[PDB]
Structure formats: structure tokens, C-alpha cells
Design a protein around this ligand. Sequence first.
Ligand SMILES: Nc1ncnc2c1ncn2[C@@H]1O[C@H](CSCC[C@H](N)C(=O)O)[C@@H](O)[C@H]1O
Ligand SMILES: Nc1ncnc2c1ncn2[C@@H]1O[C@H](CSCC[C@H](N)C(=O)O)[C@@H](O)[C@H]1O
Lengths: 204, 204
Amino acid sequence: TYNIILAKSALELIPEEIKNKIRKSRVYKYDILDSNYHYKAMEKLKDKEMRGRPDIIHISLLNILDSPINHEKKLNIYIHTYDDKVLKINPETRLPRNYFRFLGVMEKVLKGERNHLIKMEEKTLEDLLNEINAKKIAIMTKTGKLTHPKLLKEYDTFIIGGFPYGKLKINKEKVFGDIKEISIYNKGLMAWTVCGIICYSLSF
Amino acid sequence: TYNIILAKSALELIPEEIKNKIRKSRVYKYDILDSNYHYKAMEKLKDKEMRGRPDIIHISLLNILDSPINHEKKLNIYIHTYDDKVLKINPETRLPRNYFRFLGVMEKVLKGERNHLIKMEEKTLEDLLNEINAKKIAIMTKTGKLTHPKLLKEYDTFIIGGFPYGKLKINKEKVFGDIKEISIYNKGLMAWTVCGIICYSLSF
Ligand SMILES: Nc1ncnc2c1ncn2[C@@H]1O[C@H](CSCC[C@H](N)C(=O)O)[C@@H](O)[C@H]1O
Ligand SMILES: Nc1ncnc2c1ncn2[C@@H]1O[C@H](CSCC[C@H](N)C(=O)O)[C@@H](O)[C@H]1O
């Protein structure tokens, strides 16, 4: 089995520090931060540029869940979020293709309501890696060593930033497994594209 | 270069036939057919099972446009629609990640408004194929010959159905190029996944 982790993911309930600037509307009734609707209220939010993008997770998970490697039951799928929650995604999850329906599902999960296909825990990325016994970890970043996707099969765990901008920071001294920074392309790609490339590298 | 075509795509303006059954509402203010919102009015629409799924085109294009093969300018991208409109998508199109924003853009294109990156013409699939000089054509379908993605490089043109249900049918006597039915997996996959696998097979 392989672990795929979308980490520091821009999928959060509205931060306490800006709750007073954001109200539910008919246009967007969800308690999930989305910079398409909430940009001005995020003005003074820490790391604002890498937060409030649930759509990245939506499209990435649509790719992952429908991949041949996932149909073969060879993936364990995790969303680690900016505020250290971990969602474990059952391989047979039928994720709504409608963005707002996706938000409705995720909102309930993040508020601690039981979902039999998506399990939520408070958990750091480093703690997740150790708990799943990750040993050979590939951290995906454009700044990494350029690797033909053919070699990705040598790793047990893949980490992709679930955010638009910046670089994934991890405390390697808190992680038991070995971490290698890997690039699969000379250009910055979107998280869903990287997830897709990894997934199809594993089948083909 | 390669041609990638999402064909008989479920992306259309609301058909005149069913406008008397559509009640306009402020939750969905677009003139694009979407079964999420129009399911009742579509009850006696011809081919309703393969229509009104613009989300399939959104996700597929998000994958195609960010693929390495597109960043390298080795793709010509076309959307052929259920009602025989053809959109030529400039490789540098910055497609909205927000679904409703996507629908706003597509609505104006389908209504004939000028967009320097997305060019619309009234055209059948067979005429498109001939006019771009498609030579070795792979029609993607789970009912075709099972093929390793490494062999896809031997084709210049790939056709994927931009719809949720049904099979792509083409008039052989109307196409100059050679058409072959190609399956890349023994299970039905979503259009976006097939698009992803093709693009990545061309890059790697
Ligand atoms: N060229 C590339 N090679 C490997 N991984 C990449 C990549 N481009 C983006 N990624 C992955 O996709 C995630 C989101 S893209 C986020 C910004 C990106 N780190 C940049 O500087 O451009 C990244 O965190 C990384 O995990
Ligand atoms: N296993 C597969 N191999 C190649 N192409 C596939 C495929 N599964 C789906 N596709 C493509 O994705 C499009 C939409 S999926 C539509 C229904 C699908 N043909 C089925 O019966 O299951 C199809 O028109 C086809 O072009």
C-alpha cells in the first residue's frame, strides 16, 4: 500500500481571529474559509496566502479517488490541514463533484460530526507520518531533486502541499522516516496535477 | 503536437425545448444546463442521461491546462459539445477554479461573445477531425482494446467523451483519419481521469 498525504491543506473552519469579519450568506453559507468569498476578511490573517482554498483539495481528491491505483485499493489517503486536523479518506468515498456539496460534507467532518467514510482527528503532520509508520517519504516540491515519476514506486509515502502558494515546511527531527524532497517538473504545478502524476506513476 | 478533444460534451445553453419548465432562481443564475439544478425540467429531454454536466468539462480542463505536456505547448485543446459547437482552448487559458466563475465564462463564449483565448465555431466532431488533419485517432472508451498508456504516443489525436454516461459514437465514413477504440483500464473511469492519464503518458 502507498500513503498519499495532502498536507498543510487550505481547508479550515473560519479562524477565530476573523470570525467577527465573516458572516454566513445565501451566496456562501458554509463555515469553511474560502478566499473567493472571504478575501478582505483575511487581510491580517497569518499565512493568508496559503489558506482559504478548499477547491484545491476538492480537485485533488477527485483525481486521487478515481485513479486506477485507488480502484485497486493500493492507497491510503490523508488530508492534513493548516490547523493540524487529519482526515482519513476511505478509498470508496464518493466525493461530490459539486463544489458546494463538497463543502457541506467537509464542514460536518471538520465540526466533529460522524462520517463513516471520512474520519477526523487532531494531529500534526509529523505525528501522522510516525503513526502510519512512514519510512521512505517523498516530499513533493518544485525545489526538489528532479526525478522521473518512474522512481516514485521506491517510496511508501508521498506528501503534496494542499495549498496555492509557498513551500511545505516540516520538522524532520520529529519524523522517524527518511524524507527526500522530490521534483517531477521544472515548473510550479498545481497540487491536483502532482497528485495525478504520482497516482498514475504507481499504476503504469 | 497532439490534439485532445473532449467530445459530445455536456456543456450547452439551456435547450429551447425545456425553457418552459425551468423556474429561474437566484441560487443558480446561469443559462447553462446543469442537472444539479435542472433535473426536473430535463425529464423528457432527449439524451438527458449524457447532458447537463458542465462540471466534467471544468475538472477535465483544469487537469489538461496544468499538465506538463500543455506547459510545453505540445497540445491543441478542443471542446466539442453535445450540440456541435467547438471551443478551441488557448494553451495559456487561465481557467477559473471557482465553478460558478467557470460557468460565467462559458456562458458568454457559448452565446457568441468574443474571447481571445476561447474561440467558438459551429462544427460537427467529424468535420473538426478532418479540418485539423487528425490522422491516427484514439477514441477513448472502456469497451475498446486494453492498451498500456506508453503506446498512446503513437496517436496524434485523442477523443474522450465529455459526459457521465454512454458511449462515444463517430461516423467512420465521414472521417479521413484512422479511428481506433482504446481502453486504458478494465473499469469505467471519469473523463478527467482519462484526460489526466493521457496527458501524463505523453509527458513521461
Ligand atoms: N514542480 C513540482 N514538482 C513536484 N511537486 C510540485 C511541483 N509544483 C508543485 N508541487 C506540489 O504541489 C503543492 C502545491 S503548489 C504550491 C506552491 C509550490 N510549492 C510552488 O512554489 O510553486 C506543493 O506544495 C508541492 O507539494
Ligand atoms: N476505461 C476507460 N478507458 C478509456 N477511456 C475511458 C475509460 N473510461 C471512461 N473513458 C472515457 O471517459 C468518457 C466519459 S465516462 C462515460 C461512460 C463510460 N464510457 C462508461 O460506460 O463507463 C468516455 O466517453 C470515455 O471516452
